[PDB]
Amino acid sequence: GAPPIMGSSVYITVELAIAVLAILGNVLVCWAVWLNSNLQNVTNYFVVSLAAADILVGVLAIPFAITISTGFCAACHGCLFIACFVLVLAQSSIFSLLAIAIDRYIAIAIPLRYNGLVTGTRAAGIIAICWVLSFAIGLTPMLGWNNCGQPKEGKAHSQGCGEGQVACLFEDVVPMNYMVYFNFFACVLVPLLLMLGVYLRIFAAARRQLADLEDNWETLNDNLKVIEKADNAAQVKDALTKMRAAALDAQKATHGFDILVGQIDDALKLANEGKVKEAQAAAEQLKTTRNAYIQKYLERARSTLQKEVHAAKSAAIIAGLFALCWLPLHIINCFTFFCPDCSHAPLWLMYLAIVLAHTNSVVNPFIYAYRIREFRQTFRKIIRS
């Protein structure tokens, strides 16, 4: 058989290439948030909490993965920490991803009291609590749910491990039922589905508001084309009482309205006196008020919704890339567990799956750089100076 040092050289160098990209790219994220005050908000705090996980992936987790690739002798609980620490960072990433989506829902759903609800110092507390839980979840094997009780003594003596030591291998110390049932199903798969459900609600609530706003603009123009051809002298009272509610229904969304509703009740009084031809003249004052004031609100509020949807889509790419990079490893675990008769995945595909999961730590800085204008210009200034 070919020497394992040669095949490891490709894996180790590709691993070291990723760690350099992971650290550099995400230090740039934190650096941009520490400087540009316009990026300092609750959403980007979870982003920095996310980048910090990715930095630690390159600083500690990737070096660990290289060390296990050797199969070095070590005490079981020590090896158990090397093999599990990446689960802590990966769990921290999920909590950060779920926080980002929930924050975006709160902003798109109830924007009126978002500033009072989502606080800067409350996010710091949530981030802290999520990091503590991530150590608890990721280091659960160290609490007893491990295979240190039944070591492979034959593999340990084959490689000359000392007393109380074992050949360090992820599958040899971490039980596959923890990985599939506890880690993947409950602490990875369910939160991603919940995340997916939140994003469905955001895009639905966004699409509805964008419709809800235009139905007022259609009711305001259609009723403006009904008043000037009315058989009954008080028929326009129907189209004016409905426009008063439609103007207030759009005024509750987000000076020119007091001019609009003021002209509304002016033509409404002329409908209570049967003067149809004179209210029809007063009903055309609204056309001038609409073009100068109301249409601008429609366009500003349609632009703000679009900017939130775009920011909602940008965060959704991040969570989607997370699943794309980690699912292969999780599914590989699902086959080994649920099918002891199947052929176990070769070592080259494993390394491929492992490298794929580490690459997720490099793609987050390129997304903000390509999809967020404020992040992009801050990234350039840091490098230019």
Ligand X SMILES: CC(C)CCC[C@@H](C)[C@H]1CC[C@H]2[C@@H]3CC=C4C[C@@H](O)CC[C@]4(C)[C@H]3CC[C@]12C
Ligand Y SMILES: CCCCCCCC/C=C\CCCCCCCC(=O)O
Ligand Z SMILES: CCCCCCCC/C=C\CCCCCCCC(=O)OC[C@H](O)CO
Ligand U SMILES: COc1ccc(N2CCOCC2)c2sc(NC(=O)N3CCC(C)(O)CC3)nc12
Sites of contact with ligand Y (CB under 6 A): 7, 10-11, 14, 27, 30-31, 34, 55, 59, 63, 66-67, 70, 72, 122, 125-126, 128-129, 132, 136, 313, 316-317, 320-321, 323-324, 327, 347-348, 351-352, 355
d(CA 196, CA 204): 12
Residue 329 interface partner, choices ligand Y, ligand X, ligand U, none, CB cut-off 5-8 Å depending on type: ligand U
Do 73 and 162 touch, CB atoms closer than 8 A?
yes
Please, are residues 253 and 305 in contact by the beta-carbon 8 Å criterion? no
Question: Taking CB under 6 A as the rule, does residue 10 contact ligand Z?
Answer: no
Q: Does residue 63 bind ligand Z (CB under 6 A)?
A: yes
Residue 79, contacted partner among ligand X, ligand Z, ligand U, none, CB below 5-8 A by kind: ligand X
In angstroms, the CA 52 to CA 42 distance is 15
The distance of closest approach from Cβ of residue 144 to ligand Y in the complex, given in angstroms and rounded to an integer, is 12
Backbone angles phi, psi at 165, to 5 degrees: -105, 160
Residues 6+ apart with CB under 8 A from 132: none
How many CB atoms sit inside 10 A of residue 59's CB?
A: 12
Of the two residues 211 and 342, which places its CB atom closer to ligand X in the complex? Answer: 342
Please identify, using beta-carbon distances, which residue of 259 and 324 lies nearer to ligand Y: 324
Q: Which is nearer to ligand U, 317 or 332 (CB)?
A: 332
Of 140 and 364, the one with the shorter C-beta distance to Na ion is 364
Residue 361 interacts with Na ion (CB under 5 A)? yes
Residue 66 vs 75, nearer CB to ligand X: 75
Helix (H, G, I), strand (E, B) or coil at 73: strand
Q: Give dist(CA 40, CA 338) in Å, integer.
A: 46
136, interface contact from ligand U, ligand Y, Na ion, none, CB < 5-8 Å by kind: ligand Y
Distance CA 165, CA 143 (A): 18
User: Closer to ligand U at the Cβ: 194 or 352?
Assistant: 352
> In degrees rounded to 5, what are phi and psi of residue 65?
-60, -35
Report 82-101 residues binding ligand Z (CB under 6 A): none
Which span sits near ligand U by CB under 6 A: 114-122, 217-225, 306-314, 344-352? Answer: 344-352
Among 6, 143, 211, 342, binds ligand X (CB under 6 A): 342
* Residue 174, burial from CB neighbour count under 10 angstroms (0-12, 13-18, 19+): buried
Angle at 351 between CA 348 and CA 352, to 5 degrees: 85
Residue whose structure tokens are 């889509």 = 313
104 binds ligand U, rule: CB under 6 A = no
Q: What are phi and psi of 318, to 5 degrees?
A: -65, -50
Say whether 233 sits in a helix, a strand or coil.
coil
Contact criterion met (CB below 8 Å) for 65 and 350: no
What's the gap between Cα 39 and its chain centre?
16
Size of the site for ligand U (CB under 6 A): 17
- Partner interacting with residue 93 (select from Na ion, ligand X, ligand Z, none; CB below 5-8 Å by kind): Na ion
| Least Cβ distance, residue 244 to Na ion (angstroms) | 54
> HSE (CB half, 13 Å, CA atoms) of 191?
22
Q: Which residues bind ligand Z (CB under 6 A)?
A: 4-5, 8, 12, 30, 33-34, 40, 45, 48-49, 52, 55-56, 59, 63-64, 67, 69-74, 77, 120-121, 124, 127-128, 131-132, 135-136, 139, 142-143, 162, 165, 185, 189-190, 338
Q: Which residues bind ligand U (CB under 6 A)?
A: 64-65, 68, 83, 86, 170-171, 179, 329-330, 332-333, 336, 344-345, 350, 354
